[PDB]
């Protein structure tokens, strides 16, 4: 229902493809947004839909939360950028020429193709037959100030995960395409995990609200007066809204988004506030004996 009104600003456009951004940036209830509406089909991206009113990878990038890699794009024996992409097993639909993902360093990298050249299904090459990036991995993002300087990937008897060789091993091994949970913190690289311990801490911050749900349009909650605040508009809402912001009865209606709040992860017993958290099918070599 109220899932297509994004938090923050709501830009779901890639810096490369800026053509169709009248409806894809800033989203709202329009319909035409190739980089966002592909996250809303039930069954696809099960993690993002679970935390729907958080930010996608593109939104965090242009909400300045997540940075971009020094080769922000990569064309198509091949470029050294591909080493990271070849370890993850993804599936791009047809008629896509770009696709974004979270780098090893925690930045957002893209995979670009010439204009009429679409991406292969595996998203590793360019072939022939819209204007928007297909999110490769299922994730959501949030603004966080937790330091991840010491946090690294530690997994149960795993020799290599993704592009990360945790330990040097010459033993009898086991290779598989496994979907591994990962998270990104401020001063940390990607941290792959064995189990995914996500817990939300709900609150009353402006990102926990969806607005203009009566008479559809998106409203900026910033325009609503808080109690005693200055305002410049006249909002109304649920009990949660009318506890922090002053209400009447009616320039907009503001409710609370279920699950919206600061979400912490557990990494090796410690609980830290991550920037992004997601799922990724990568090559995993586990030790035996
Ligand atoms: Au933007
Ligand atoms: Au959420
Ligand atoms: Au080659
Ligand atoms: Au492109
Ligand atoms: Au396999």
From TrEMBL:
- What this protein is called in its record is Envelopment polyprotein
The places in or outside the cell where this protein is found are: Host Golgi apparatus membrane; Host endoplasmic reticulum membrane; Virion membrane
Reading the lineage from the top rank, the first entry is Viruses
Task: Please indicate which part of the intact protein appears here, giving the first and last residue numbers and the full length.
Answer: 156 to 469 of 1197
Signal peptide positions are none
**Family listed:** Belongs to the phlebovirus envelope glycoprotein family.
């Amino acid at each position: 229902p109220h899932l297509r009104n994004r938090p923050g600003k709501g830009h779901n456009y890639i810096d490369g493809m800026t053509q169709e951004d009248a409806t894809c940036k800033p989203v709202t209830y329009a319909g035409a947004c190739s980089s966002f509406d592909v996250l809303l089909e039930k069954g696809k991206f099960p993690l993002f839909q679970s935390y729907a009113h958080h930010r996608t990878l593109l939104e965090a990038v242009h909400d300045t939360i997540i940075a971009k890699a020094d080769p922000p794009s990569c064309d198509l024996h091949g470029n050294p950028c591909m080493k990271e992409k070849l370890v993850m097993k993804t599936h791009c639909p047809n008629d896509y020429q770009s696709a974004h993902y979270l780098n090893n360093d925690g930045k957002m990298a893209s995979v670009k193709c010439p204009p009429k050249y679409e991406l292969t299904e595996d998203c590793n090459f360019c072939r022939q037959m819209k204007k928007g990036s297909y999110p490769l991995q299922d994730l959501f993002c949030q603004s966080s100030e937790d330091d991840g300087s010491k946090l690294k990937t530690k997994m149960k008897g795993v020799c290599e995960v993704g592009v990360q060789a945790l330990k040097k091993c010459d033993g009898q091994l086991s290779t598989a395409h496994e979907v591994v949970p990962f998270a990104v913190f401020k001063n940390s690289k990607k941290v792959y995990l064995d189990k995914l311990d996500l817990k939300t801490e709900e609150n009353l911050l402006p990102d926990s609200f969806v607005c203009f749900e009566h008479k559809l349009k998106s409203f900026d909650i910033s325009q609503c007066p808080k109690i005693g605040g200055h305002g410049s508009k006249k909002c109304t809402g649920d009990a949660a809204f009318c506890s922090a912001y002053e209400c009447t009865a009616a320039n907009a209606y503001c409710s609370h988004a279920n699950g919206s709040g600061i979400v912490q992860i557990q990494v090796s017993g410690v609980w830290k506030k991550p920037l992004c958290v997601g799922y990724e099918r990568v090559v995993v070599k586990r030790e035996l004996s």
